[PDB]
Symmetry: C3
Subunit: 108 residues, 3 copies
């Protein structure tokens, strides 16, 4: 069975290489998991900052409009001065944006 | 003896390797779905921020129309404020839409 | 023990197939990595564009406030007309946003 014993040694070597490949593959998956978590964290933190900025901007523009409305009183009002543009607003989407950020942060 | 026993150990080693491959294929499966979920939530968040910033720009510009009107009798916005009068807001809504569309795409 | 030659034959087949599965898997992981990089790149570019828009909107709104401040002086000032809301501002978070974008782009060198 001299032929057989040679093949068995070959198969053992081949198996050893396969095990090492599988081990490397698991390290690569671990690393990819780490990267995905890291990107999610960085996305979440950025969206949180932009959400703060856009909410503060909306509030500040609305206060700017209150002043403008006051000023346009003697002129007959904002709608008479600007036309229908007067009724254009800024929808508050803070809750909707916070909702997506919360789902992103689930993977931290 | 020796040869039947070596085959026995090889067979169980192959079983375990096949199981590990099956487990790795599931792990990669779940990773594909987690990456797609991230991309989808990113795109949805960006779409909302697109809407908010676009509306903010429009609203601010309408405020400026009112301000230009009111400053007319004082010599106009540029005379009153100086060169800051010319500072604008670049409309980047198409640029942002295009990025969102890229994130949403597969294949 | 002619069965032995044949158990061996089946083991050699199985190994061949396992090798192909491994090649295929390394490819799938490579595709996942590239996909992850693509998303990072797209995220960073979208965030940069929103950084620009939000920065300009803050600047433009503050200028609108300067005009308003001028206009309200003769009614005794913005704070008199608006009340304490006059002091509400827009925090400049551009450095903070830019740092986070930079970290996304920075990861694209490893
Ligand atoms: Cl404004």
């Amino acid at each position: 069975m001299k032929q057989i014993e040679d093949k068995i040694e070959e198969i053992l070597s081949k198996i050893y290489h396969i095990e090492n490949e599988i081990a490397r593959i698991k390290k690569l998956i671990g690393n990819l998991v780490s990267r995905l978590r890291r990107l999610a964290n960085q996305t979440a933190k950025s969206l949180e900052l932009l959400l703060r900025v856009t909410t503060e901007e909306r509030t500040f523009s609305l206060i700017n409009r209150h002043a403008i409305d006051f000023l346009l009183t003697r002129w007959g009002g904002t709608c008479k001065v600007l036309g229908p543009d007067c009724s254009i607003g800024i929808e508050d989407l803070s809750r909707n944006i916070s909702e997506q950020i919360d789902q992103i942060k689930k993977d931290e």
